[PDB]
Every structure is written in C-alpha cells, then in structure tokens.
Amino acid sequence: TKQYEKSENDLKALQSVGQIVGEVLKQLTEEKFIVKATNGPRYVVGCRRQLDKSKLKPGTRVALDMTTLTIMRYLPREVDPLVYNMSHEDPGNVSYSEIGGLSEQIRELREVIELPLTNPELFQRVGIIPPKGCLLYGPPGTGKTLLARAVASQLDCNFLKVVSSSIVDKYIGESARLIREMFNYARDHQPCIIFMDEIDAIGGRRFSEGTSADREIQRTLMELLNQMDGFDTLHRVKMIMATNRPDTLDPALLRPGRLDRKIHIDLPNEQARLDILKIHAGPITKHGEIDYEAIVKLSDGFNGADLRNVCTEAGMFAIRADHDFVVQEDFMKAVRKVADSKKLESKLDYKPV
Amino acid sequence: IDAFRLINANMMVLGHEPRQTTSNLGHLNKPSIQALIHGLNRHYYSITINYRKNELEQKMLLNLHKKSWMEGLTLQDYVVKEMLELAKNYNKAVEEEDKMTPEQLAIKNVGKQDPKRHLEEHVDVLMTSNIVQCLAAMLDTVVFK
Amino acid sequence: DVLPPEADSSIMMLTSDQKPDVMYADIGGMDIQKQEVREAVELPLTHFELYKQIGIDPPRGVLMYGPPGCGKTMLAKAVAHHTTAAFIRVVGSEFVQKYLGEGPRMVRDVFRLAKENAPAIIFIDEIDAIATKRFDAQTGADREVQRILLELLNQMDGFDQNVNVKVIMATNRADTLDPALLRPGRLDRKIEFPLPDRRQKRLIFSTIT
Amino acid sequence: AVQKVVVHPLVLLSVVDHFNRIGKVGNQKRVVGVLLGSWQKKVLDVSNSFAVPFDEDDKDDSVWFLDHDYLENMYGMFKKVNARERIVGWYHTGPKLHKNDIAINELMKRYCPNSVLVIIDVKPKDLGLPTEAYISVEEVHDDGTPTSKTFEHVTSEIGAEEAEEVGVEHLLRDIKDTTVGTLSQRITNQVHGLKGLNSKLLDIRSYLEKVATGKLPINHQIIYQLQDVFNLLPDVSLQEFVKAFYLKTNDQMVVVYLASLIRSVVALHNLINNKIANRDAEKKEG
Amino acid sequence: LREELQLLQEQGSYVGEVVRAMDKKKVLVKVHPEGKFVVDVDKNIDINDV
Amino acid sequence: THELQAMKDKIKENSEKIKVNKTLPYLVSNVIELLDVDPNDSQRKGKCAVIKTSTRQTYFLPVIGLVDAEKLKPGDLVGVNKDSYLILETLPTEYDSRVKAMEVDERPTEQYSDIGGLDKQIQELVEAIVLPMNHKEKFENLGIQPPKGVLMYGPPGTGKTLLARACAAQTKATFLKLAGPQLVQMFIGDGAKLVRDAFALAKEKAPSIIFIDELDAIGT
Amino acid sequence: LLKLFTTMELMRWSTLVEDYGMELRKGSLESPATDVFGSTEEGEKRWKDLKNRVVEHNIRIMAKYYTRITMKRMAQLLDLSVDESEAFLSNLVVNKTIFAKVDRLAGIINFQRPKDPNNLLNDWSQKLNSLMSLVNKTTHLIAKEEMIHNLQ
Ligand SMILES: Nc1ncnc2c1ncn2[C@@H]1O[C@H](COP(=O)(O)OP(=O)(O)OP(=O)(O)O)[C@@H](O)[C@H]1O
Numbered sequence A: 001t002k003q004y005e006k007s008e009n010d011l012k013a014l015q016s017v018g019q020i021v022g023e024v025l026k027q028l029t030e031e032k033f034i035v036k037a038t039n040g041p042r043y044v045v046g047c048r049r050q051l052d053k054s055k056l057k058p059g060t061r062v063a064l065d066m067t068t069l070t071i072m073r074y075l076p077r078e079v080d081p082l083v084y085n086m087s088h089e090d091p092g093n094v095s096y097s098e099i100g101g102l103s104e105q106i107r108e109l110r111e112v113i114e115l116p117l118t119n120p121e122l123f124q125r126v127g128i129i130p131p132k133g134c135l136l137y138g139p140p141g142t143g144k145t146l147l148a149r150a151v152a153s154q155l156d157c158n159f160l161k162v163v164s165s166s167i168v169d170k171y172i173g174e175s176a177r178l179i180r181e182m183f184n185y186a187r188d189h190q191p192c193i194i195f196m197d198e199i200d201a202i203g204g205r206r207f208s209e210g211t212s213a214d215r216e217i218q219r220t221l222m223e224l225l226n227q228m229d230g231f232d233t234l235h236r237v238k239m240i241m242a243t244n245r246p247d248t249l250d251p252a253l254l255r256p257g258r259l260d261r262k263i264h265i266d267l268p269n270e271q272a273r274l275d276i277l278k279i280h281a282g283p284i285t286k287h288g289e290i291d292y293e294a295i296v297k298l299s300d301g302f303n304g305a306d307l308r309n310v311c312t313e314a315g316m317f318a319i320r321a322d323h324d325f326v327v328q329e330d331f332m333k334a335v336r337k338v339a340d341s342k343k344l345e346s347k348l349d350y351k352p353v
Numbered sequence B: 001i002d003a004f005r006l007i008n009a010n011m012m013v014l015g016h017e018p019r020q021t022t023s024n025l026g027h028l029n030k031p032s033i034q035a036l037i038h039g040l041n042r043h044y045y046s047i048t049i050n051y052r053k054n055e056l057e058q059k060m061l062l063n064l065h066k067k068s069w070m071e072g073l074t075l076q077d078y079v080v081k082e083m084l085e086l087a088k089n090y091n092k093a094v095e096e097e098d099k100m101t102p103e104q105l106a107i108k109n110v111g112k113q114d115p116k117r118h119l120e121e122h123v124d125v126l127m128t129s130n131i132v133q134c135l136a137a138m139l140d141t142v143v144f145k
Numbered sequence C: 001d002v003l004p005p006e007a008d009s010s011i012m013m014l015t016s017d018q019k020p021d022v023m024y025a026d027i028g029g030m031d032i033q034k035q036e037v038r039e040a041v042e043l044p045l046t047h048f049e050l051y052k053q054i055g056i057d058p059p060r061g062v063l064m065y066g067p068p069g070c071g072k073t074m075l076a077k078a079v080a081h082h083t084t085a086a087f088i089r090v091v092g093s094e095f096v097q098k099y100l101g102e103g104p105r106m107v108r109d110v111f112r113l114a115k116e117n118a119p120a121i122i123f124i125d126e127i128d129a130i131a132t133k134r135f136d137a138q139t140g141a142d143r144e145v146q147r148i149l150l151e152l153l154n155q156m157d158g159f160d161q162n163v164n165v166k167v168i169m170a171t172n173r174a175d176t177l178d179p180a181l182l183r184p185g186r187l188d189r190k191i192e193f194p195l196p197d198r199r200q201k202r203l204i205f206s207t208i209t
Numbered sequence D: 001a002v003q004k005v006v007v008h009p010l011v012l013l014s015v016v017d018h019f020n021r022i023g024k025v026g027n028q029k030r031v032v033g034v035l036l037g038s039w040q041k042k043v044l045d046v047s048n049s050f051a052v053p054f055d056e057d058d059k060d061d062s063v064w065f066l067d068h069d070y071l072e073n074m075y076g077m078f079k080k081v082n083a084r085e086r087i088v089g090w091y092h093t094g095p096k097l098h099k100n101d102i103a104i105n106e107l108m109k110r111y112c113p114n115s116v117l118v119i120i121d122v123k124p125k126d127l128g129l130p131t132e133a134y135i136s137v138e139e140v141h142d143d144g145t146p147t148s149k150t151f152e153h154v155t156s157e158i159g160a161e162e163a164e165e166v167g168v169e170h171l172l173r174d175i176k177d178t179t180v181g182t183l184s185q186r187i188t189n190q191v192h193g194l195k196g197l198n199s200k201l202l203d204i205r206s207y208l209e210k211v212a213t214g215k216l217p218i219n220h221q222i223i224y225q226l227q228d229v230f231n232l233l234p235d236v237s238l239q240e241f242v243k244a245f246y247l248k249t250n251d252q253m254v255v256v257y258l259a260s261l262i263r264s265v266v267a268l269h270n271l272i273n274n275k276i277a278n279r280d281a282e283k284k285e286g
Numbered sequence E: 001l002r003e004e005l006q007l008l009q010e011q012g013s014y015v016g017e018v019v020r021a022m023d024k025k026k027v028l029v030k031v032h033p034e035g036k037f038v039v040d041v042d043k044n045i046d047i048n049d050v
Numbered sequence F: 001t002h003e004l005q006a007m008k009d010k011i012k013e014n015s016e017k018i019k020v021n022k023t024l025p026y027l028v029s030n031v032i033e034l035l036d037v038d039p040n041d042s043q044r045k046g047k048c049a050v051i052k053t054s055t056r057q058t059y060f061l062p063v064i065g066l067v068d069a070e071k072l073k074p075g076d077l078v079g080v081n082k083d084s085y086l087i088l089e090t091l092p093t094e095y096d097s098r099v100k101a102m103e104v105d106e107r108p109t110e111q112y113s114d115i116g117g118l119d120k121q122i123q124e125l126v127e128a129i130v131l132p133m134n135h136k137e138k139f140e141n142l143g144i145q146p147p148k149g150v151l152m153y154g155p156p157g158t159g160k161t162l163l164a165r166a167c168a169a170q171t172k173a174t175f176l177k178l179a180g181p182q183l184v185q186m187f188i189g190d191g192a193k194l195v196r197d198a199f200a201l202a203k204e205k206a207p208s209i210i211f212i213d214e215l216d217a218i219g220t
Numbered sequence G: 001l002l003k004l005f006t007t008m009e010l011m012r013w014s015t016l017v018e019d020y021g022m023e024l025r026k027g028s029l030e031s032p033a034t035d036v037f038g039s040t041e042e043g044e045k046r047w048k049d050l051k052n053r054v055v056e057h058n059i060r061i062m063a064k065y066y067t068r069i070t071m072k073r074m075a076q077l078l079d080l081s082v083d084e085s086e087a088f089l090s091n092l093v094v095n096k097t098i099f100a101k102v103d104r105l106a107g108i109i110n111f112q113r114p115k116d117p118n119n120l121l122n123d124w125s126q127k128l129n130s131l132m133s134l135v136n137k138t139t140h141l142i143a144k145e146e147m148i149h150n151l152q
C-alpha cells in the first residue's frame, strides 16, 4: 500500500511550478544570454549550474524560468504541423499498377522518384541534375491522388502532406514560416515527397488583388517561389503539386525549377480500360458468364472514379434484384443508364460555363 | 524585509497620532518607501526592527563566511600569464583609444566644449593591473624560500 | 549599458560565405557586363582615393528586372566567387513578422554592416511584394514593412556622400514600385537585364554541354 | 556514492540556536539533530534541518535515543512545504565522535541508503575551515579484523544561495571587501606559510611520535606515499634551481617589462594631465 | 541615483500621451502599446495647463 | 498493517488540495508530445512535455501528473490551474466555441408522402440514404460501397428543403442543419475549420444525416 | 605480433626472422606464408616494409622519449647502418608523422620539441600541478591527522 505514499510524494514534486519556453537569439557574454519568449519579449538573463555547453545552441528553443527567466533544459523546436501531415493513410503498393494507364506515366513516375533514392551514381558520374519536382494536374482522367499517394503511403515514415486548407491558416495567421518549415523538413527526411492539391485558391495571382486577403496569399507564394528555385538545395527532395487549371500559377510556377515535370493525366482508353475493369471486377462478385469488352465499350470517356462507383451502382441495382451472382445484363443496364445520367449533369467536357 | 501592524479603524473618533519617542518614528517614516506602501498606511502603521546581539554567532558568521571564501583553504588559489596578455591588451589597446581624447582636448583653440576629464577610471585600473602582476610574481619568492 | 551594437535577432546575416553557391563560369558577362559591373558595383567596395579625383558619385543603385532570363541572384553569386564578400540573402516578404518593433532594428543592422566593413553587397529579391501600398489599418503589418523599405530608402541618402555602401536589387514587377524608389538621387544606375533571345541560346547551350 | 558535501550557514545556525536551547537548560552531551539534505547531483547540498531532543549517557556511553515521532510527522510538515528536501542523515557538534555513532547511523539506514553525519563546531577556534563531514562505508581491514564500519572523512565546503545573503551579509558590515589585487593575495601568503608550515611541523612531530609509540597506525601506506608526491622537489639547499634559475627571472621578464612600460605611460597620463588642468585653474583664478 | 532608481524601480516610469483634457479633473493618458487610460490630479500639472 | 487509514487520509487531503486545484482554472492549454532526458553533467532521468496556453504563452512543465503520457496524441483543452501549472485531468469535448455544435435538430413534422410525380426520382434519393442503414451487412458480402454525396436541384419551389429534411425521420439518424452561408465567417480559414469540425462530431455520433442548401453558390 | 605493438621497446630483428621464418615450415596450413613470404617480388616489398614498420613504431615512442639522441646511438638501437638510418629518417620525415631536427655535423639529433618558444607553460605546469598538491597536503594531512587521532 506504500504505492499511495509513492504516488503522493510524486505529486508533491508536482507542486513545483512550471516554467516558460523561448527561443535563443544570441549571447552577449557568459552571464547574459539573449532569449526570445514565444510571446516576443527578449531578455538577457543568467544561468544556473546544472546546465552544459549544449544549452546555448545557434538559435534553438529553450525553457526559461518564471522568476529569473533562467534556462533549465533545452528541447528540439517544432511548430508540429508534420505529425498532422503523417496522419494520412492509403492501401497500396498494389494501387500503383491497378490503374493500368498510361503505361508511360506508370514507368516514368517510378523512375524519377525511386531511381534518385537507390542510384545517385548515375547523376554524379554523368554530371546531370536529377529533377527535384513534378506537377500532376487534373481532372482529364484519374490517377492524381491514387498513384502519387500510393508511393507516399508505401514510403512509410518519409513523406510530407499538404492540404490547401492549411495555407490560409487563421486570421492574422502566418503561413510564411510554414512554407519555410515544409521545405526545411523536406531537407531533413530524404528523399522527401510533398503533395499540394487544389492550388487554384491558394495560388493567387497578384494581377487582381482583392481586399486584404490577397496579399497574404502572395506572401505564401513568394516563400514557395524562393525556396523551390533556390539558392537552397532541394536536389534530393522531390515535390509534387496539383491544380485544376494552370491559369493562376503565373510565369513563376509555370516555369521549370519550382515546377519541373508537368505530366497531364490522360483519360482511360479502350485498351487501358480493359485492365482497370479487371481490378474492379475483383471485389464484386459476378456471374460465371462475363465479358469485359461489354462494359468497356458501353462506358467511354469516364474517369476511374466514374467506372468504379458506377460498377458499385450496378451492385446496388444487383441487390435490388437480391441476386448474389448477377449476369452482366443487369450490370450493363445500371452501368449505361446511371453513367449516361451523370453525363447530362456536369457540363464539362468540353464546354466551359 | 518589511514590518506593519494594523491600527483599529474604529479609532477614527479618537486621535490617530501616537506614539511617543519620536526617534525611531521619524527614522521609520523615511525613506517613505515609494507611494502605495504609504498609501497602505491607512488602517496600518509600520514598526521598527532592531537586532539584539547575536555577536556570539555573528562573530563566527563573518569568520565562517570569509574563511571558506578566501582561496578555499586560503592556500588553494596560490588566467595568470594568459590574463597578462589580455591585461597588456587592456594596458595598450585601451590606452591609445583613451589617449586620443587629450589630443581632442587641444582644439586648438578653443572651439570645443570644455572642461572634460578623461583621466579616470582606466588609469587606476592600470595601477591595480601592475599591482596584481607584481604581487602575483611574488608568489614565486614567497612559497619558495 | 547598450549593445556593441550587433545585428540582434534580425535577418540572420552572413550564411552566404559557407560556399559554394553558383560558379560564374556559366555566365559572368565577360567583357560586356563585367565592365558596367566593375565601375558601378565592385569598384564602390572601396576605391576611396579615386572618387575624390573625378568628383562623380558612384551610387549604390543596382536594379534588375524582366525575367526570363533569371540572372539576378546568379549575378550576386557570380561576384561572390570573384571577390570574397558577405552577402545578405533575403526576400521581400520574409521579414514580415508578428512584431513591427524589430523593423527599425533590421534596416539599421542590415545597412550598418555595409558602412563599417565593406566586403558587402546586399541583395533583395522581388521587392514588389512590399512595394504594394495597402491603405487599411488591419494591414498595418504590411504598411510598416514598406516603411521599412522606405526607411532603408532614407538610410541610403544618409550614406551619400559617399563612403560607403553597395545595394543590388531585383524584382519581377516594376509597376508596383513607389516613385521615390527609382527617383533620381537614390538609384542613379539601372541596368536592365536583356532578354536572352538568340544570343544567349548558344551561350547557355555551350555551358550546358 | 558521496564525494563532497555542501553545508550552508543557515543549517549550521540551526545547530547553533539549539545550542542556546540545551545550553541554558543543560545538561550533558551536546547538540544532536537530524539533517535535511538536498541531492541534485553527486555533490551533496544541505539547506535546512530540524533539531530533535537527544541524550547520550556516559556509563552507558553507548546509549542513545532519537525521537522518531518527531522524526516522522515533522518530515511530513517539511515535505509539504518543500518536496525536494529530504533527510540525508544526522549531525552533531562533536567536537570528537564516540564509538557509539555506529549504532546511530545503522538505525537510520532504513530511511536512507547511506546516512552522512556532519560534525559541526559551535565556537570556532582552530585550525581552519570548520565543521567536518563523514561517510559510512565498510573498508574491512588488512589486519584480519571482522568487517569494520569506520566513518571516512569527506571534504566539506561552505556555499551560498540567492535571497539568503539579505540579512546574513548585512549584519556583519565590518569586513572590507574584497579587496582583490592588493591585500587579498598577500594576506593569504602570510597565512599559507603559517597554516601550511604549522600543520607541516604538527605532522612531522606526529611522524616522529609514531616511532616512540602509536604504531599502528602503520599507516599504511598513505603517509609516505602521499609524502613522496610532495618530494617531487623537496626543495632542499639550495633549491636545485640551476635549471630553473635562468627560467626564474624569465618569469619575471614580462612582469618587470609590463611594470616599467605601463607605469611610464601611466605617469605620462598622471603628470601631463595634472599639470595642464592645474595650470589652467591656478593662473586663471587670480 | 539609487534613491531615484527606487522611484523608477517597481513598475518603472512610463511615458504617457494626453489625447484630451477633461473638466472633471481627470486627464486622459495614452500608452503606446496599450490603450488610452485616464488619471486625476496630479496637482503638479494644473488642469488648464494640460 | 493498520497504517492504511492514516495514509488514506493524506491522499484525500492531498486530493482536497487537488479539490482546490479543481476550483478553478483561468487557463486552458494545448498539448505537445516530448521526450527529454538530460545527462548531468548523479543522474536525473524522466520525461517532460511542452504546454501551450489560450493567452498565446507556451509553458514548460514535467510530464503530468496525473494522467500519464500513454494517452494521447497531442490534444488541447487540458486544465492548467493558476501558477501551479499542473494538469489534473484531460476534459472533452473537442473544439471549439460555436464551431462545435452548429444546431441540434430532432425530427421533422412532415413526411415523404406529401409529394407526387417524383415517385421514381425521389426513390433515387430515398435508396442511397436508406440502403447503408439496414443493408450494410449485405454490402460487406457483395463488396458494395454506399453513396455519400447527393445533389437535389430544380426550379424553386421544388420542395427540396422540407422533402430532404423529411427523409431524416425515416432514416432515424440524427439531423444537423447546415447551409452554405453557415460555413462562411468573418475571419479567414474558418470554413476549413467548420467542415473538419462537423465530421469530427459525425464520426463520434454514429452515422447521421447532414443537409446543406445552395451548394452551387459557395461552389462557384 | 602483439608483443611488438604493446609496450614497444626493442627486439632483435633476427629473432623476428626466427619466428616468421619458421612460419614457412609451420603447418598444416601454409597459406599465410604463401601470399606473404612465398612471393619473391611481393614479399621483398613487404620485407622492406616490415623494416619500415619496426623502425616507425620505434620512432613514435622515441619521439615521446626525446629530448635528444646521438646519431651513432640510433644506428645500434635500430640494428642497421647509419646510412640506412638516414634513409629511414628520409621517408618517415616526408610523411610528417614525427617532427624532427636532424643535425648530421655533430651527430646530435632530436625528435621535436619545436625550440620551446613558450614561457607561461613552464610557469603554468610548475605552479598549478606542484603547488596544488602542496596545498592539497593540508587538506588530507589534517584528515589523516583525524584518522590517526580517533584511535591513538
Ligand atoms: N481507376 C480507379 N480505380 C479505383 N478507384 C478509383 C479510380 N479512380 C478513382 N478512384 C477513386 O476515386 C477517388 C479519387 O481519385 P482521383 O483523385 O484519382 O480522381 P479524382 O481527381 O477525384 O477525379 P474527379 O476529379 O473527376 O472526381 C479515390 O479515393 C479512389 O478511391
């Protein structure tokens, strides 16, 4: 029962008041150390006898006391968006080769990513600069989020994710230090891979500057433009971006450097649609008599999200008939009808609104 | 430290101005310690603090403190010549910058605001600097023979 | 007691001298650009006794504009490999922070390293971000940093005449620039980076091969 | 284990003020109390403590009583006000310990793994830095005795702390501070020879005393082993400095040169500026 | 100076800005980082002198 | 073995000192996961964490004490009391202010039987919402994914406001009122905070029904 | 093999040829003596290198012991000619493993120390080391005085 006495004595040590944290700036002398608290005041204070030479550091966060503001222990500094960035997930592996097309985009994205990791020798011996970035835009077909994130999730602890909602951040919020942090940790984990999706809102041009909120978009831009075209070495880390249209990217992003390789997604083709139907027919049960050319021919110019989810819509029409294994006749009904209904809903392609 | 005592607020009908023996009263009223302290003199009054003789232990308090503060044994401390290279930097590099001002004392003459005394405090520092190094060199002839 | 003073927590300066950056062998502007850069950039480093003889002010002003081609920072890195110098590598938008009180310290410490010691060439890339003039008070964080740009615009007048300072500058938009920036008396030398066109093709194909 | 300890003047007076307790009421024995230590590192530090009623009979020289009811509840009183503060052992004013102290330490080893007793001095006399520190270990012995518990001397040094110098350093007021550079080093030179050569003469007289009687201590061997470390140079007549002679004045080389060179410039600052400023005010006044 | 430093010690001697003067004997005082405060007599600086 | 009660009294009096630590915090903190051990320079080992505040300050205190570091990934809304700077318990629920709960609705009065001529096209809406409820066990057998987003449009009045709301009574799921303008606020990035806020309550409150109106406006 | 590395000192080089000359007859396994001492052109290069290993391992410890030495004493210690000493002093000095001052006119040669320009080092080594032990006397001397007086 002495564990209670042990537990309460540990809570007696909890009577010790907590301290405050700050960032070291410089040092005037041994008895005065410039430290900037997270609030922004800067103090020059002494120190106690329990610390070492590793406490000083070149501008690293420290914990200031609440009385004399002296430093107790030092800890590594992070603003910690990254743990939130690593909270993503995705199956595959397999989903790499499941899309089926285009075969040239399947093989190339495997090279520019994996080859610099395993074989740097080809770059240094031939004397060529490997691509440090890439651009995958849409939606002329699917595979943007599927193929890129598959290698991401398979690369495990080495990856960086960016959602377009985190750039605006909060009122009078600072995303300029996020752009510098995103590329700072990109230079830590190697090779790092960064995904930026739906940049049309956060890629704001400075031609027409609305209200007070367009400039803070330009600030996040110029922070991206500086480090991607640096002057700061990104050669080992790979970057990826995504957008609906490259209208607002400006000559800065449309240029090479910051955006290196722009690979346009291609819609599924009758030859390639035969492969994507094989992977769709796996999870769904079918009748013993099935023809893959029937579904491929009846559905043309449809994205992979259209084909899959309508093939599940065919299963929802199949459960309307309660049959477990269903012939493709009931499928071709639900596949053609529901898909042709989707075509009269959204205008594009080809006509803009 | 500090000292205070609460005077009864119900005494408002009676006089507020004791006590006798104005000696320790006038000395306690000064310095008057800022304002809010005297602003709290409402309902309160301070009180003098003196030390009855501890000199039995107070004699050892000075003895125990200085005996451990002198070279730890008074022996153990007897930065030396390396500080002299730093000293002769403060005896030379600091000298020429301090001796430009007597050239600035000559105007000449006289268009600049006078008088200005540049003598102190570095001159007495150079005095003690050589007093240190000479009595530190005596450590050779003191410990030895 | 005050500081020495020092650069405090601003910038932070130096970081250019780590080396290397970009070799000037690619494009150094041989015999054409190295001439105009000689007299108007690297001669102002000191050349004290020569300027009193001619009586003409070699102003700090170096303007760059019109990418493509890039140029710009490469020209700052090209001189870095010519003579050893401490360069200030910054952006227009990076020094905007949650505290506007540091602003008066920044331009002071940035320009105090040019006058006291002069292996110094200061480079600021794409000033058109802070060159945008925003009236609203909630944007005063932006209104303060263009005063920062105008404060260093005053500090360049405190230098002349003459010794010593050098400031090179590059931006992709010259329309948003304040008229006081390019007004005579401050920047008297504007070198427009020419469009590479056909002449730099065989030049950039020679350095890539 | 415990290498060195740090004893503050605050806890020391907590032994001294209790000497005024049992001093006026009597009678025998001395001041004995339980020591509250603070361990932040291998170096030991002591801040506060509490004095406990204690008595030791003479006859009956081995009889001792600590009060554990005062040791238990008051610890919780101090544990509540100070969590890091805990009892590191006991203490007493000596001046000389008795063999019964083996029982006092072994009884309190249930509270702390190793109890460090501190012998203090209420009236400072001789010969030097006061009080004392002992640690309880078992060295057995070389002669074949049963396992022996003998307290080994621990180097003790006084130390200061923030906010505790308010009243302490104010009450004295009679000391001249420091003053480093003039009288500070030269006073110790008269002391380091005094205190150095008296313990010398005191120990060499005891070494001669070991021949007559008092053997053992044999010692062994620490007496002569550490003496021969002193014997790297004796130094004996005369000084054997033939190699260190030309080097001797060579150490006085820079000292005399910096003296004469700077004093000549200090004179140039003293003589010139004085005659200028004096001729100014003197002749222009009348 | 040590006695003068004491008067400046506790919170420190600040610099106020008077935006307007009031007939109520209180004087508005504005601190640069903070807002606009107010204070009464102040018998050294007269009301009409503000 | 009778020392228990006297020892049990001090844990309640120390808890009584926690009961004065219960009343009352003016400070709420955000949590940061940290592991720190400093060799000296006998040895001091342990674990410490970083502590934010609602006043924008960021404090430093050892690992709590009470609730250990086993839970959880860094959160917010942890009670920190005055200058003591100790977190006794981590209190729910999520965050924050009026972004937390938009509006709590129970059931509509009307029913889906008040319409006609839409019978074939209303079932397409009735199917997709009803099928995941009961038939989810049948979907796991056939590997079928239920629909999620559904669009309801027509020249007004089409009755879509009350009709799509009347479907919440048949599905038995909790209804939460939402709209396009409801996702708009004064500051920037607030819309991104609202949508991530509803799905956090959506995952906790079990499958439910959330209806929005005029998505094309905000979707332009 | 390890005895030459630990504690160094010296040995008769022919005794090393006695131990490593019998390893050709040793075996069982003759392969260690094949790739090393079995090759005529490769072994002679390793034989002269073996001479370079035994001479350089001595120069390293002699650099610690010098101070000074006479050139004639170096030949009898290295068990080779004075001309071979200059050859072994030539190839080792360009490797700058040991700084040396070679004076062949009087025969006196020394490995370091560079003319001893320092002064304070002699004052710092003497005073600190010695006198701190002299002031540490009173520390543990009165402690040993307490140890002996608690008994007799
Ligand atoms: N060929 C496919 N096979 C399986 N699942 C797919 C396929 N295409 C799309 N999907 C599904 O659709 C989702 C979105 O995929 P992706 O980003 O590649 O297309 P998209 O950009 O959403 O297309 P759109 O913009 O036309 O909706 C993914 O979560 C994925 O599960």
Ligand SMILES: Nc1ncnc2c1ncn2[C@@H]1O[C@H](COP(=O)(O)OP(=O)(O)OP(=O)(O)O)[C@@H](O)[C@H]1O
Pocket (backbone or CB within 6 Å): A229, A230, A231, A252, A255, A257, C026, C027, C067, C068, C069, C070, C071, C072, C073, C074, C075, C204, C207
């Ligand atoms: N000899 C050369 N001629 C022209 N361009 C070159 C040469 N050598 C390198 N570059 C280009 O210069 C780029 C880096 O220069 P710099 O950092 O000045 O670009 P930048 O001016 O910041 O770009 P932007 O104009 O988009 O802001 C490299 O990407 C490289 O392609």
Ligand SMILES: Nc1ncnc2c1ncn2[C@@H]1O[C@H](COP(=O)(O)OP(=O)(O)OP(=O)(O)O)[C@@H](O)[C@H]1O
Pocket (backbone or CB within 6 Å): F114, F115, F116, F155, F156, F157, F158, F159, F160, F161, F162, F213, F214
């Ligand atoms: N086809 C219909 N069947 C039954 N009731 C209808 C129909 N159309 C309109 N109403 C009735 O008209 C009233 C007015 O609602 P209204 O139709 O204007 O909303 P709405 O147009 O559906 O709104 P929104 O277009 O934003 O969804 C409703 O209470 C609804 O009951």
